[PDB]
Design a protein around this nucleic acid. Structure first.
Length: 54
DNA sequence: CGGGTTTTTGTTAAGGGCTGTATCACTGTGTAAGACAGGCCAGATC
């Protein structure tokens, strides 16, 4: 949920207000994503689709 | 043999400072013997 959600919301969250380091940026953003599945499922669905396609 | 534990295993993803090889430009020189082949020739011989 949160992994695919961060890999999806990368553009705006990384080009609007990143933070101190890429580490802390993606950490806080993945936390917010996991605390949003209820609103991030299709990103994980696309991830699993690519995984099956591989 | 196996569902669910037993302690784990990728993995794979989003960017960033440190390390470890791979390049990059750039320079040191015309010899030294030996074998064989023609060409020239300067005395040998009839």
């Amino acid at each position: 949920a949160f992994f695919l959600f961060c890999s999806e919301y990368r553009p705006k969250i990384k080009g609007e207000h990143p933070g101190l380091s890429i580490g802390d940026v993606a950490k806080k953003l993945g936390e917010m994503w996991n605390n949003t599945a209820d609103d991030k499922q299709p990103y994980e669905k696309k991830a699993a689709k690519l995984k099956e396609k591989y």
